């Protein structure tokens, strides 16, 4: 019983860490302007939120209206900050193991293409990540949670989607994997913010929810793709 031929990875939260860095920028920019919020609140409600929606949130939940220089200073600091993106603990090891085993894999991300490659570069994963790296410009803009990106990724590997496992840390990305016909394994490495929690991924339909790259490799070995410890 070999369930899988190939692995499809999300980027943010699974291979690289960036949500944490961006939350820290929101926190310091607001703090300097009077408002002190917890990183968990910032990650939960500001992430993937549009700027006017953040403004609405701040007014509604915190009676707060940032001063005029808010937009200008945030974009400055968000830019200086992309620099500090790091690899997720054990991600390089998982990519190295799949490569040594000859297991096909691809990366699918909603990031704009330049940003996608920038993050892999600064995290030191460019060489390990390989050549199958897809952002929504490859599928006409129809990014996650549409299945298109993962359908396309599987096609490029020459593998049926139903024979892929998708490694995701959000309902947005996990739904794209499931809608493509793949199996979903959630991966929620602790100490890093993720858009959704384990219960939400399980309810969505994740076959399992893993908590470390070491756990991921062990599961992959159980599935016949890697060699067990
Ligand atoms: Na993600």
Distance of alpha carbon 185 from alpha carbon 43, whole angstroms: 22
Distance of alpha carbon 124 from alpha carbon 162, whole angstroms: 31
CATH of region 1-18+85-229 = 3.40.50.1000
Q: For residue 15, how far is its CA from the centre of ligand 1 (angstroms)?
A: 9
Q: How far is CA 176 from the centre of its chain?
A: 12
Boundaries of CATH 3.40.50.1000 in the chain? 1-18+85-229
Contact 139, 110 (CB under 8 A): no
How would you list the strands of the sheet with 6-10, edge to edge? 133-134, 105-108, 6-10, 164-168, 183-187, 208-210
Residue 86, C-beta contacts closer than 8 angstroms, at least 6 positions apart: 16, 17, 122, 123
- Is the four-CA dihedral 140, 180, 150, 176 of positive or negative sign? positive
Distance of alpha carbon 3 from alpha carbon 222, whole angstroms: 10
Q: For residue 174, how far is its CA from the centre of ligand 1 (angstroms)?
A: 9
19-84 homologous superfamily: Putative phosphatase; domain 2 (1.10.150.240)
Distance of alpha carbon 118 from alpha carbon 43, whole angstroms: 21
Q: For residue 14, how far is its CA from the centre of ligand 1 (angstroms)?
A: 6
Computed on alpha carbons and rounded to an integer, the radius of gyration of the chain in Å comes to 18
Q: For residue 103, how far is its CA from the centre of ligand 1 (angstroms)?
A: 22
Distance of alpha carbon 106 from alpha carbon 167, whole angstroms: 11
Containing 158, the helix (H) or strand (E) segment is none
Helix axes 171-180, 148-157, angle to 10 degrees: 60
Report resolution (Å) to 1 decimal. Answer: 1.8
Experimental approach was X-ray
Q: Is 109 helix (H, G, I), strand (E, B) or coil?
A: coil
């Amino acid at each position: 019983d070999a369930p899988f031929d190939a692995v499809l990875f999300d980027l943010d939260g699974v291979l690289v860490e960036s949500e944490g860095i961006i939350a820290q920028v929101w926190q310091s920019v607001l703090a300097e302007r009077g408002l002190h919020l917890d990183l968990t609140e910032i990650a939960m409600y500001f992430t993937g939120q549009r700027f006017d929606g953040v403004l609405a949130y701040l007014a509604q939940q915190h009676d707060f209206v940032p001063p005029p220089d808010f937009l200008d200073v945030l974009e400055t600091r968000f830019n200086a900050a992309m620099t500090g993106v790091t690899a997720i603990e054990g991600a390089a090891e998982t990519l190295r193991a799949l490569r040594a085993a000859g297991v096909p894999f691809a990366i699918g991300s909603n990031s704009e293409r330049g940003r996608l490659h920038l993050k892999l570069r600064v995290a030191g994963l460019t060489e390990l990540a390989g050549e199958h790296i897809y952002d929504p410009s490859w599928v006409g803009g129809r990014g996650k949670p549409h299945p298109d990106l993962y359908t396309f990724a599987a096609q490029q590997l020459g593998i049926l989607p139903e024979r892929c496992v998708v490694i995701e840390d959000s309902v947005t990305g996990g739904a794209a994997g499931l809608a493509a016909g793949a199996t979903l394994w959630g991966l929620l490495v602790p100490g890093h913010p993720h858009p959704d929690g384990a219960a939400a991924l399980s309810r969505l339909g994740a076959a399992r929810v893993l908590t470390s790259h070491a756990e991921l490799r062990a599961a992959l070995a159980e599935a016949g793709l890697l060699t067990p410890a």
